[PDB]
Design a protein around this ligand. Structure first.
Ligand SMILES: NCCN[C@@H](CC(=O)O)C(=O)O
Ligand SMILES: NCCN[C@@H](CC(=O)O)C(=O)O
Ligand SMILES: NCCN[C@@H](CC(=O)O)C(=O)O
Ligand SMILES: NCCN[C@@H](CC(=O)O)C(=O)O
Ligand SMILES: O=C(O)/C=C/C(=O)O
Ligand SMILES: O=C(O)/C=C/C(=O)O
Lengths: 496, 496, 496, 496
C-alpha cells in the first residue's frame, strides 16, 4: 500500500524529513515514559554513593543494584512501574525490605528535578545537533549561490538587489546566536539538585559531588530549596525553542512567498510538497505550513510554564507546568523538514534576475549615483528618482529600459534643472549585478563579501560541532563510570 | 497636603521604593521619546564616519554637526522632531540642503534598529544594577538570620526545619543565574547593525567598525539582512524580564503567606504596607501584590513580540512588537519595592520557632533516627512515624510533646514489635534546632553551611559589580570619544 | 497490587475524581484518532445527500454506504485509515472505483472543518455537563453551611465575617456566567461548513441544508471561504476553557490556604490528599495543585491558536493550531477533581468562628456603629477604631475581648473626646454572627440572603440541565435520522 | 510645516484613519485618568441612594453633591485628585467633615470594580461602533465588485476562481460573529457590583437596584464576593479584542500579498501607503503592517490578565492585570485604518482576470466536467487533469490555451483510453467566469449568490445599528436621570 497522498503533482514519496512532521505527534512519549529510564540511573548512582559513604553495606548495595536491573526489565512492559513509589514497591517484592533503603537521604522531589534535568539535557543536545544540521544545510546552500541575483524584500515589497547566498547567511547568523542560547541554557540545566531531598537536605552525610559526577552533571544546584523549587531552566528551554522556531517560521514564510504562483522565484522540491484531493493543479507547501504550525504551538509551553511559576511561592510544587517530549519532538521534526527544504530548494535563477532588473529595486543606486556625480543632496535626488519611477510605471517602462531621456524629463519637471550624467552612468546604475558588486562592505551581497561570511560560518560550525562532541562524550564517560561502579559492587559482593 | 492613604494602621509615609510602584505608569516615556536622544548620537557618529571616509567634506561635516545641536534643542520641546524625517527636515530648515547628506549610505531601518538597541542597552544595565541591589539586600538579610529557625514549605504545607537565612540564599542563587541571563543577553544586544542601510548595505564605502566603536557597541551585526530584520534580542529581553519577575512574584507570594493573619511568622514594615478605607484592622500587602501584578504583565510583551516574529518573513517589518519603556519601568519599580521589602522585613522569630517545634515538621529526623539506630528500612519506619502523627493529632499532642510512650504505641500497633530507642534519642530527634544542625551538607540550613553560601555569594556579587562597572565605563568612554571627535571637526572647520 | 502512594497519612484509596488527574494524559486520543469517527458520519450524510440530489445512483450509493461500514471496521485497528485519502483508497480496494465518487463536490478542507466541529461540539456538551456537576456540588455544599461563620479575605488578609455558604455562592455566580460562555460558544461551533468544498463551493448542485441537518448542525457557515478559513470558534473554545479554569484555580488556591497547617480552617478529605515518601506528617493537596496545573496549561492552546491566526491570511491553511483532546481531557479531570473536593471538604467550623471572633475582622461594624449612634463621619470613626486595633494588638487583647475601656481610651487619645456608646453596643458590634445577620442585602452573607441566592441558583441549574438535555437530544435525533436514511438506501438497492 | 514623510511616491496626505495609527500611543489616557470621571458619577448616584434611604439628610446630601462639582473641577487640573482617598480628602477640605459620609456602606473595592466596568462599558460601544463601520465598508465594497473575477487562495496557492465581492463577504460573516461576541460580553460587563462594599456587603440598608439603575447598569452582580473579585469580563474583553484583531490581521496580510510587486492584483490608495527615505520606488503598506502590529500586541493584555487570575484566590486583589485604554485605542485605530483600506482599495480588475484564466485555478471544473460527462470517478479524472497541468507547464501553455489535443494526450498517456468530450466542453470548463457562475449554491461566488449574502448582511447591519442605538440611549437616559436627581436634591435644600 503506497502513500495515498502521493497523487497528481505530488510525485514520488515524501522526503523522510517531510514525513517526520506527520509522525511525531502519535509517536511522542509521555513525560513519565521519557523520564523513567533516567530515574533508574539516579537510583544506581545514588546507592553507589550511599555505599561509598558507609550508609549501605556492600551486601545491601549489591542486592539493591541487582534488583534494579530486574525491575527495569519489568518496567519495560509494566507501565505502572514508571513512577517512583510503585517502582520502589516492586523492588520490595523482588529483593525484600532492603529495597526501602535506596531512598535514604532522598525524596521524590529532588529525584524528579534531577531526572527531568537529565531528560532535558539529552533533548538539548538532540536539538543542538538538529540546529547545527539546519545551519550546515543553510551555509552549504549559500555557497552554491554567490551569483544568484535576486531582490531582497522589506515590508513584503521589492527593496534592493542581493543574492540568495547573501540571504541565507542572514539565517546562518540567526542560527549562530540561537546555538549560543542553547549552549548557555545547557550550563544552567546541567546542574545536579540531588542531595536537596525534600527541600532542606538531610542528616545522612551524602557526597553530593559524587552523585552529580556519576550522572554527568557539570556542577551542583547548591541551595537545597533551589534544588527542588528551581524551574527557570524549564521556562528558558521553552523560550529558546519558541524564539528559534520563530526564526524558522519566518524563513518558511519567506520561501512560501518565493514559491507562490505569482512570485515563482523558487519551487519546493517535489519531495517536500503535496497536492489537493480536488484541485489537480496544486503544489502545496505542506512542509512549510506544518513547520510554522510547530513554531506557533511552541508558544504554548512557554506561556503555561511561566504562568505556573507566577502562580506559586518559591517552593517545590506539583502545580508547575513541564516542557513535554511531544513539544520538543515537534521542534525536531520542523528543523529537519526545513533542513531538507533549504537543501533541495529549486531557485528559478532566471525569473529572479528578471525581477531584479525590471521591477525598480535598483533605484537606490540611481539615486546614489546622482549624489556622487553632481553633488546634490540625497533628499533632492530621491525626489527626482521617485518621479522617474512614477513616470516609468505610468508609461509601462521597466527599470532596465529607463533611459537618459526619462531621467532628464524628471529632473526638469521636478527642479527646472537638467543634470550632468551620461547614458552610461545610468545604464550601469540600473544594472542589478552591478548593484550587488558595489555592495561589498562587511555583510553585503557582493560575492567576495558573502564568501567571507561563509568562511567565518564554516569555522564557527566547526566549533559548534566540537562543543557538541565534547558535551556528548562527557555524558557517555560518566554513564560508563557509573556502569563500572555498579558492576564492581555487584562483583565485590558475589565473590566475598 | 499629605499622602491621603496613610491613615489608620498605615503609619508614616510610603517608603520611596514602595512609592515607585504608584508612579512608573504615568511617568514612563513613549518609545519614540525614549529613543530619539540615541538617534542624535547615531547622527553624530555617522557623519563623523562619513567625514573620515571622505564622503563629506569637513565644511559639510561641521555644518551638519553644529546643526544637530540646534535641532536637538528644538526637539527638547517640539515633539514632532523626534522621528527621523521630521528631524531631517528641521535640519534642512536650519543649515540648508547639506542636511540631506547625513543620510548617505543609511536608512531609517538600520537607524531604528541601532537606536533601539542603544536604548535597551542602557535599560539592561539599569536592570542589572537593580537586580544586583535586589541580591545584595537578600544576601545581607540572610547574614543576619543564620539562627532564625523556621519551617520551609512544600506544596504550601510545613515540610522541614530551616532558617530564614537558608531560604534567602535560595533567592540569591536564583538571582545569580538571572544576572547570567542578563549578561548573556547584553552581548547579543550590544552589536551594531549600522551599515546595513535598508537591508542590503550600500555602495558608499562606509567603515562599519568605526560607527560601531563610536557608539559603544562591542561588535557588529554582520549580515545586513540580520541587521534590520534581527529581533530575537528584543524577544529575549522580554523573556528574561518575565522569568526573573516570576521568581520575584514567588518571593512576594511567599512573604505574603508568611505575613497572613494566620501564619504571622513575618510582618511587613509599616512603610511597605497600606490599609483599607473601610476596614480599620487591615495591614495590606500592597507592595507585594503590585509587584506580582508587574510580573504577570511582563508576559504580555513577551507574547506580543513572539507572535509578531512568528507572523512575518525574515525581513525588516513595521509589524514587529517592541519592548516598551513602561514595561521595563514596571520591572524596576517592582525590583526596588522587593529590595526594600526584604531589607525591612520583620520576622517574628518566636512564632517561627513555635511552628518548627510544634507542627510536626521534625518527623523526618524521627524517622531517620529509627533507621540509623535499629536498622529498619525507611519505608517501614515511615509508617510508624506516620501513625505517630495520626495519633498525636487525634490526642492533641504537639510535636515537641511526643514521648517514648507514643512512639512505642505506634511501633506496636503497626508492627507488633517495640523498638530500641531511648527517650533522649527521641527528644533530640524532635528538636528543631538539632534538625537544622544535622543538615550541614552543601546548600543546607546549618549555619556553617549557609555562611558558606553567603561567602560565595559575596564574592559573586563583587564580580557582578565589576562586570557592571566595566560595561558602564565602556559606554561612557565611547560617548566621550564621540563628543571629542565632533568638537574637533567643528573646531577644525571654524579655524580653517 | 495496591496503589503504592496510599501510605502513611494517605489512607484509603484515591477518590475516582482524584485519580482522573493521573490518567488523562496517557489516555488522551490524538486529534486524528478522536475525529475520524466523525469523518465517517460526514461520508454517510454526504453521499446520502448526493443520492437525494441525483448525483449518485441508488446502486452507487448503497455500494459506497455498505463499503464505509467495512472500512470503518478496518480502521478500528488499522491506524493508517484514519486520514481521508488513505481511507478513500481503502474504500477503493473494497468496493471498486465507485469509491472515488463519494468526494464529488467536496474537499478535505471542508471535511476537516466540519469533522473537527463535530468533535468539539460533543466535547463542549461533555464540558457543560462537567461544569453543571461542578456547580451542583458547589450550590449543594453552600446549602449545608448557611450557619458556618468564617472570615472572607481580601489581599490574603482577614476582611469581614461571612459564611462558607456565602463564599460558595460566589463560585456559583462565576460558574453561571461560564456556562453562558459555553452555550454562546456552542451556537458558533454548531454551524455546518460542508458545501464550501476547497473554499469556493462547487458546480455540483448540493443541498447544503440537508447535509447540515443530517449531521446535527443548527445552521450553516454560509460563505464558503468562512467555511474552511473560519477558526475563531477554536480560539474561543480555548479561551473559555482558560478563563473558566482560572476561576477553578482560584478556588483551589483558596481551599489550599484554608487547609494550610497555619490556617487549618478546612481539611481535604483523605481521598483527595496524598503524602510524602520522606516526610510522614504530610497531608498534601495533590488534587488542588494538579487542578491548578491544568488551568495554567490551558493558556498554551489559547496562545498557540491565536498566534497561528495572526500569522496567516484569511484562507484555509494547514499552519493553524488546534484544540487537542488531551487539553480538554485535562479540563474535565480538573473539574471532576474540584467537584469532589468541594463535596467532601471538611470545614473546621469551630476554628472558623474563633478567627471571626478574635482576629479583628469585626472592626467595620464597630466603626459603622459609632457613625450610626453618635453621627460622626466615617473617616474619623475609622481613625478611632484603627488605633483601637493598634492598641489591642500591642496589649494582646483579641477582638472579642475589646471593651468600653479601650474604645474610650482610643477616642480620647485620638480626639480628646469620649464617645456615647454602651458596653452593650460594643459587645454586639464585635459579635461575628451579628456581623453576618446585619449584612442582609442582596448577595450578602446573612442566611436569609444566601438562601435566596441558592433558590435562584437551583432554578438556573434546572434550566442549565434543560438546555443540555435539549442539545444532546437534538444530536441523537439527527444521528438516528442519518442511520435510518443509510439503511433505507442499502435496503432499497438490495431489494431492487 | 507639512508631513515630512509625504515625499516621493507618498503623495498627498495620510488619510485620517491612517494617521490614527501614529497618534494613539502618545495620546492614550492612563487607566486612572480614564476612570476617574466615572468615579464621580458613582459618588453622585451613591449619595443620592444614601439620601433616598434616609442614611443622609437632605442637608448633608446637597452639601456633598455640590462639593463633588467643585472637586471634579479641581481634579480637571490636579492629577492627584483622581484616586479615591485623595479625592475624598479634597472634598473634606471643601465642604467639611460631612464629606466622609459619602463612603458609608461602600469601599474602594466595589467603587473601582463598578467604575472600571463603566469605562469598559463605554469603550465596548465605541468598539462595536468601529466594528460596524468596518463591516459596513466591507459589505459596501463587496456590492461594487460582484463581477470582479479573481482567484481565491488556499495555503498561499491559487485555488479556484471567485470574485472580490465573494471574498469580502467572508469578512462580513467573520465580523458578524465578532459583533455577537461583543454584545454577549456587554451583558456580562453591564452588571453593577456596588453594594458589595469590601467584599461582604454592609449593615447599612442600601438599595442596590437604585444605584445600579442610576448608573446605567442592566442588572446586578449579586453575590458580594463576585462583586469585587469578579474579573472574567476583563479577560473576555481582552480575548474578543485579540480574536477580532486576528481576523483583521489576516485581511491586512491578504491585501498585503495582493498588493505585492509580484501579485499586483491590488494597490493601496496613496493615502494609506508610505515610502522609503532611501529607496524611491517603495510604495509601503505601513497602514497594513501597523494594523497587524496592534493585533499581535493585543495578545499581551489577554495573557497578562489570565496569568493574574490564575495566580490568586477568589478574592479582591490588587495583583490583577487590567485592560488598559491604550490597548483599546490601538484596536480602534487599526479598525479605522482597515475600514479605510477596504473602502479605498484599488483592485487591478484586469490582472485579476488574467491570473484566473491563465494560472490553472480552473482545473477543478475541468475535472468535474469529465466526471459529469463520461461518468468516470473523481480520483481517476483528477490524475488525468493533474498530468494535463504537469504537461502544460513543461510546454509553457497557460490554462486558457489548453486544448482538446492536450486533454486527450494526458488521458491516453495515463490510462490508454481517450475520453468523450468536445473542444467546446473543455473551453467552457476552463472559462473562469463560467467557473464563477456554476458555483451558485449558498455562500458561493456566483453574483446571484453573493448578492443574497449582501442582502442578508445589510439587514443584519441594520439590526447591529439598532442594538447599538438602544444600548447608547439607555446609558444616556440613566445619565440624565442621575443629573436630575442631583439637581433636585441641591434645589430642595437651598429652598428649605
Ligand atoms: N494539501 C492540503 C491542503 N488541502 C487542499 C484541498 C484538498 O486537499 O481537498 C488544498 O487546499 O490544496
Ligand atoms: N489596600 C487596598 C485594598 N482595598 C481595601 C478596601 C478598601 O480600601 O476600601 C481592602 O480590601 O483592604
Ligand atoms: N505529594 C507529592 C509531593 N512530594 C513530597 C515529598 C516526597 O514525596 O518525597 C512533599 O513535598 O510532600
Ligand atoms: N516605510 C517604512 C519602512 N522603511 C523603508 C526604508 C527607509 O525608510 O529608509 C523601507 O524599508 O521601505
Ligand atoms: O488537507 C489535509 O487534511 C492535510 C493537509 C496536510 O497534509 O498538511
Ligand atoms: O484599593 C485601591 O484602589 C488601591 C489599592 C492599592 O493601593 O494597591
Amino acid at each position: 500500500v503506497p502513500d495515498a497522498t502521493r497523487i497528481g503533482r505530488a510525485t514520488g514519496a515524501k522526503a523522510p524529513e517531510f514525513q517526520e512532521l506527520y509522525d511525531f505527534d502519535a509517536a511522542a512519549l509521555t513525560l513519565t515514559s521519557a523520564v523513567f529510564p533516567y530515574d533508574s540511573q539516579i537510583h544506581r548512582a545514588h546507592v553507589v554513593m550511599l555505599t561509598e559513604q558507609g550508609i549501605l553495606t556492600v551486601e545491601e548495595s549489591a542486592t539493591i543494584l541487582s534488583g534494579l536491573a530486574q525491575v527495569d526489565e519489568l518496567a519495560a512492559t509494566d507501565g505502572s512501574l514508571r513512577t517512583y513509589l510503585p517502582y520502589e514497591a516492586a523492588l520490595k517484592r523482588t529483593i525484600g525490605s532492603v529495597a526501602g533503603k535506596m531512598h535514604i537521604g532522598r525524596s521524590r522531589n529532588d529525584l524528579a528535578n534531577a531526572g527531568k534535568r537529565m531528560f532535558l539535557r539529552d533533548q538539548l543536545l538532540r536539538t543542538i545537533e538538529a540546529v547545527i544540521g539546519y545551519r550546515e544545510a543553510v551555509v552549504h546552500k549559500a555557497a552554491d549561490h554567490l551569483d544568484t541575483v535576486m531582490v531582497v524584500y522589506t515590508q513584503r515589497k521589492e527593496a534592493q538587489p542581493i543574492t540568495l547566498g547573501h540571504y541565507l547567511m542572514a539565517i546562518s547568523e540567526n542560527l549562530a546566536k540561537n546555538l549560543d542560547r542553547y549552549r548557555e541554557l545547557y550550563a544552567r540545566i546541567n546542574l545536579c539538585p540531588l542531595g536537596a531531598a525534600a527541600t532542606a537536605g538531610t542528616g545522612w552525610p551524602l557526597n553530593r559531588d559524587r552523585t552529580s559526577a556519576l550522572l554527568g552533571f557539570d556542577g551542583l544546584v547548591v541551595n537545597s530549596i533551589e534544588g527542588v523549587a528551581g524551574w527557570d531552566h524549564v521556562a528558558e528551554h521553552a523560550f529558546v525553542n519558541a524564539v528559534f522556531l520563530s526564526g524558522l517560521s519566518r524563513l518558511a514564510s519567506e520561501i512560501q512567498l518565493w514559491s507562490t504562483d505569482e512570485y515563482q522565484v523558487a519551487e519546493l522540491d517535489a519531495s517536500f510538497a503535496g497536492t489537493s484531493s480536488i484541485m489537480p493543479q496544486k503544489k502545496n507547501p505542506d512542509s512549510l505550513e506544518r513547520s510554522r504550525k510547530a513554531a506557533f504551538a511552541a508558544m504554548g509551553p512557554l506561556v503555561g510554564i511561566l504562568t505556573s511559576l507566577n502562580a506559586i511561592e518559591y517552593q517545590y510544587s506539583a502545580a508547575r507546568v513541564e516542557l513535554e517530549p511531544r513539544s520538543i519532538d515537534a521542534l525536531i521534526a520542523a528543523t529537519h523538514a526545513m533542513t531538507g527544504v533549504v537543501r533541495t530548494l529549486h531557485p528559478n535563477k532566471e525569473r529572479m534576475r528578471q525581477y531584479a532588473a525590471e521591477n525598480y529595486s535598483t533605484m537606490t543606486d540611481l539615486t546614489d549615483m546622482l549624489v556622487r556625480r553632481v553633488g546634490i543632496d540625497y533628499r533632492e535626488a530621491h525626489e527626482i528618482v521617485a518621479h522617474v519611477v512614477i513616470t516609468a510605471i505610468e508609461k509601462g517602462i521597466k527599470a532596465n529600459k529607463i533611459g537618459l531621456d526619462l531621467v532628464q524629463e524628471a529632473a526638469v519637471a521636478q527642479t527646472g534643472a537638467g543634470i550632468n550624467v551620461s547614458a552610461d552612468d545610468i545604464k550601469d546604475a540600473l544594472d542589478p549585478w552591478q548593484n550587488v558588486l558595489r555592495r561589498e562592505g562587511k555583510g553585503m551581497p557582493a560575492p567576495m563579501s558573502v564568501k567571507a561570511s561563509i568562511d567565518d560560518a564554516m569555522a564557527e560550525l566547526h566549533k559548534d560541532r566540537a562543543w557538541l562532541a565534547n558535551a556528548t562524550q562527557a555524558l557517555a564517560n560518566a554513564k560508563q563510570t557509573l556502569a563500572d561502579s555498579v558492576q564492581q559492587i555487584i562483583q565485590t559482593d558475589r565473590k566475598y
